[PDB]
Design a protein around this ligand. Structure first.
Ligand code: COA
Ligand code: I55
Ligand code: I55
Lengths: 166, 167
């Protein structure tokens, strides 16, 4: 059984060690036309390995022994009532136990507390696993930026944008 | 007729007073599918009227023969992805269609090359067909959008379209 709280300074090491790295046999391929964009899930072989290089809050999911099993960092922009999920990670050995949903429910709580109109996140097109998890939690594609990762370690990837009403 | 320079503190009043408002007979309509987005230019009738609500930031001003600010562009460089963002570009009504827009974008391109940018990038509302057509002519293409960006704003019902070009 897992419990939730606001992250504390002593959690910083455990949070950094839940690093987000993953292997995927699928990516969301972006086809650019002059008049629009198509997202299509596509097989890759060999599997792709991805390693990552007041209105803010970080929540931590905690096991019975007090160990951080996941976290979410969120930020509110009053201008458009957007709660951004800046990061959400569940430790690999603690997946499929509802922690992801629980951290997103804490994000939804902060949203309602601030009077947000929608949840929003950025996810790289190669992160098919996270995209599938977000789809199941009720997020849909609201856009993308094919240029965001130009001149970065992630060049060749596209930033996909997902939202849901609060 | 028009010259360009870096904005000075005394220009702030003239820049704020420049009216970016426009009338359009067309909008770029955004169709959302589960698997993508289509942009299609479409007629609106009657015409839509739209009113708008440190070393790596710069504002340029276009100046008429009498020294009056006729247009401006605010730009910002992010070294992380080598992006020069055109944050704002506005030409005063009655100085439009005289090459000021191109001239301000050329100054943006100069700042890009000075900072070693890889691309120019801008946000434009889907209803701003005139600016979109001008950006297409200057060499920009659609690199994305955010259909949720204007939720809870005066612009709700519009979509943010994203355009880029290599430097
Ligand atoms: C982009 C903008 C600044 C251009 O203003 P401008 O000074 O009249 O533009 P220029 O005269 O430099 O023209 C630039 C190019 O775009 C073209 N262009 C401008 N409007 C066009 C239109 N509606 N259809 C087709 N081409 C168009 C020009 O003909 C020119 O191409 P050319 O060199 O082949 O002739 C325009 O958006 C504007 O009038 N500003 C109003 C404010 C605004 O739209 N704000 C931006 C949203 S934040
Ligand atoms: N859920 C967040 C997320 O996906 N993070 C990305 C993630 O860390 C890496 O992306 C891949 N593809 O690995 C990384 C590329 O090296 O880009 C991150 N995205 C960013 N960082 C930018 C700056 O904070 C400011 N301006 C932006 O617009 C932000 N966008
Ligand atoms: N060329 C710039 C531009 O298009 N400006 C828009 C413009 O001023 C209005 O939009 C329409 N459609 O009128 C306005 C809402 O009404 O939103 C602006 N866009 C923004 N402002 C946000 C903040 O700066 C911080 N974070 C963002 O992500 C920015 N996005």
């Amino acid at each position: 059984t897992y419990a939730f709280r606001v992250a504390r300074p002593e959690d910083v090491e455990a949070i950094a060690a839940i690093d987000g790295s993953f292997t995927t046999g699928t990516v969301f391929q972006v086809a650019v036309a002059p008049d629009g964009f198509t997202l299509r899930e596509v097989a890759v072989d060999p599997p792709l390995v991805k390693v990552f290089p007041g209105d803010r809050r970080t929540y931590v999911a905690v096991g019975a022994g007090g160990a951080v099993a996941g976290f979410t960092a969120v930020s509110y922009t009053p201008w458009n009532g957007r709660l951004t999920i800046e990061d959400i990670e569940v430790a690999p050995g603690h997946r499929g136990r509802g922690i992801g949903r629980g951290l997103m429910e804490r994000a939804a709580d902060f949203a309602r507390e601030r009077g947000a109109g929608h949840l929003w996140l950025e996810v790289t097109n190669v992160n098919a696993p996270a995209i599938h998890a977000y789809l199941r939690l009720g997020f849909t594609f609201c856009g993308l930026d094919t240029a965001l990762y130009l001149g970065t370690e992630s060049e060749g990837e596209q930033a996909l944008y997902m939202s849901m009403p609060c």
